C-alpha cells in the first residue's frame with residue numbers, strides 16, 4: 024500500500040508532472056519506442072517517433088495529464104482509472120506487459136529532469152506506477 | 165474481476181486440488197525447479213528437487229492446500245491471503261517475479277492431470293492465479 | 306537461447322508424432338480465449354476463434370510451416386527467420402504475443418502427452434518456444 | 447543479446463568517464479531501497495544500505511571489477527562469466543535481481559548525464575545490462 028509519507032511524495036510529484044506534461048511525456052514515449060520497438064506498432068499513424076515529433080508530443084501530454092490527475096485520487100484509484108482501464112482493455116488491446124515497460128522508462132525521464140531523485144522518492148513513485156499498471160490491466164478478460 | 169461463472173469454475177477446481185494436494189503440488193514444484201533453476205535457491209535445505217522427493221512433496225502439499233482454501237474466499241481474497249503475503253514479503257523475501265512463473269507451471273500440472281481442460285476453464289484459472297500472485301506481492305515495500 | 310543436443314532430439318520427435326496443423330490450431334484458439342488482446346490484428350476472424358473455424362485453420366497452416374522450418378535447422382533459426390521477423394513488425398504484431406502462444410502450445414502438448422510430459426520434456430519445449438519468440442523478435446527496429 | 451559497434455563504443459566511453467566504485471555503490475543503495483527483497487543475502491550489512499556505508503562500498507568494489515572485465519571484451523562476456531555465474535547460483539542469488547540492478551544503474555547514469563542521456567544512449571545502456579544479466583544467468587542448472 025501507499026503510506027501517508029508516500030502519498031505526499033506522489034501528490035507533490037503530480038504537480039510537477041502537470042507543469043511539464045508535454046515535454047516529459049514526449050521524452051518517456053521516445054524512450055519506450057527506442058528500448059522496446061514493438062510498442063511502435065500501436066501508433067501506425069505516426070510520421071515519426073522522436074521526442075521532437077508533434078504526434079509524440081500530443082500523446083505524451085495526454086498520458087502525463089492523466090497520470091497527474093491520478094495523483095489526486097490516491098484514496099480512490101480503482102474507480103478513478105476505470106474509464107481508462109476499459110478503453111485499453113476493450114478497445115485498444117495494448118498487451119498489458121507494456122505498462123510495466125513504460126513505467127521503467129518514466130522513472131528515467133524523472134531522473135533526467137528532476138533536480139534530485141533519491142532512492143526513497145524513487146520507491147514511492149515506483150509503487151504508484153505499479154498500482155496504475157495493475158488498474159489499467161483490470162479489464163482485459 | 166472474477167465473474168459468477170468464473171467463481172463456480174474456481175470453487176469446483178479447489179475441491180480437486182484439495183483431493184490431490186501432495187501429488188499436484190510436487191509436480192508443479194518439480195516443473196518450476198526444472199524450467200527456472202534460480203528458484204531452487206530458496207530451498208537450500210532440500211536433498212533433491214524431483215517430484216519423487218519427500219521434501220518437495222511436503223512443501224507441495226502445503227502450497228496446494230493454501231491454494232485450495234483460497235478458492236472458498238473469492239469474495240474476500242485480500243484479507244484471506246494477508247498472512248501469507250506478510251510471510252513472503254517480510255520474512256522469505258522471494259522475488260515477486262517468481263509468483264507468475266509458478267502460475268504458468270501450475271496450469272501445465274492441471275492440464276496433465278485433469279480429464280478435460282478447455283480454454284474457457286483455463287481462462288478462469290489464469291485469472292485466479294493472477295489475483296493470488298498480486299495479493300502475495302502486496303507486502304514487499 | 307540454446308538447446309542441448311538431447312533437447313533438439315526431443316523437439317524433432319514431437320514434430321514427428323503430433324498433427325502439425327491441428328495442434329497449432331488448438332494452441333491458437335487457446336491463446337485467443339485465455340489472452341483476448343492477442344485477437345487485435347485478427348478482426349477478419351469475425352469472432353470465430355475455434356480450432357475448427359476456417360480462419361483459425363488457415364492461420365494454423367501458416368504458423369506450422371514456419372515452425373517446421375525452425376525444427377529442420379535448430380542451429381540457424383535466427384538467421385532463417387530474419388525476414389519473417391521484419392514482416393511481423395510490418396504487420397504490427399506485439400512481440401510479447403509470441404511468448405503467450407508458447408504457453409498455450411505447452412498446455413496443448415500436456416493435453417496430448419499427459420503423464421509422459423514430465424519436467425524435462427516440459428523444459429525442452431519451453432526453451433524451444435523461447436528460441437522461436439527470440440528469433441521472431443530479433444529483426445524489430 | 448547483441449550490442450552494435452556504436453553501442454560497444456558508447457559503453458566503453460561511459461566506463462572512462464564515471465567513477466567505477468562510486469556509481470556502482472549508488473546503484474546498489476538504490477536497488478536495496480527500491481526493491482527491498484534484494485537484501486535477502488545481505489544480512490551482514492546490518493541494515494546499513496547507504497552508498498557510503500563500508501559494506502556497500504566493499505561489494506561495489508567487487509561488482510565494478512567484474513563489470514570492467516565484461517567491458518574489456520564485450521564479445522566474449524558469456525564465456526568469461528561462466529564461473530562467476532556458477533558461483534552466484536552457489537551463493538543463492540535470484541537471477542531476477544540482476545535485471546533490477548540494471549534498472550537502478552540506468553537511473554544513476556541518468557542522474558550523472560542528465561540531458562545527454564538521450565533515448566539512443568539509454569537503449570545502449572539497457573542492452574549492455576541485459577547482456578550482463580544474461581551472462582550471469584547462463585550457468586544456472
Ligand code: HEM
Pocket residue numbers: 062065066082085086089090107110111115117121122125155
Ligand atoms: C502510464 C500508462 C498510460 C496511461 C496513463 C495512458 C493514458 C492514455 C490516455 C489518457 C489515452 C487517450 C484517451 C482518450 O482521449 O480517449 C490513451 C490512449 C492510447 N494509449 Fe494509453 N496510456 C498509458 C500507457 C499506454 C501504453 C504503454 C501504450 C502502448 C504501448 C498505450 C497506447 C495507447 C494508444 C494506442 C492510445 C490511443 C491514442 C489515440 O487515440 O490516438 N498507452 N492512453
Ligand code: HEM
Pocket residue numbers: 203206207223226227230231248251252256258262263266296
Ligand atoms: C501459489 C503461490 C504460493 C503459495 C500459495 C505459497 C504458499 C506458501 C505456504 C502455505 C507456506 C508455508 C507457510 C507456513 O507454514 O508458515 C510457504 C512457504 C514458503 N514459500 Fe511460498 N507459496 C507460493 C509460492 C512460492 C514461490 C514461487 C516460492 C519460491 C520460488 C515460494 C517459496 C517459499 C518458501 C522458501 C517457503 C518456506 C518453506 C519452509 O518454511 O520450509 N513460495 N509458501
Ligand code: HEM
Pocket residue numbers: 343344346347367368369371372389392393396398399402403406437438441
Ligand atoms: C510463434 C509462432 C509464430 C509463427 C512461427 C508465425 C508465423 C507466421 C507466418 C509464416 C505468417 C505469414 C507471413 C506472410 O504473410 O508472409 C504469419 C502471419 C501473421 N502472424 Fe504470425 N507467427 C507466429 C505467431 C504469431 C502470433 C502469436 C501472432 C499474434 C497474435 C501472430 C500474428 C500474425 C498475423 C496478424 C499475421 C498476418 C495474418 C494474415 O495476413 O492473414 N503471429 N505468422
Ligand code: HEM
Pocket residue numbers: 484485487488508509510512513530533534537539540543544547578579582
Ligand atoms: C549485475 C552485476 C553483478 C556483478 C557483475 C556481480 C559480481 C559479483 C562478484 C565479482 C562477486 C564476488 C564473487 C566471489 O566471491 O568470488 C559477487 C558476489 C556476490 N554477489 Fe554479485 N554481482 C552482480 C549483481 C548482484 C546482485 C544484483 C546481487 C543480489 C542482490 C548479488 C549478490 C551477491 C552476493 C550475495 C555475493 C556474495 C557477497 C559476499 O560474499 O560478501 N550480485 N558478485
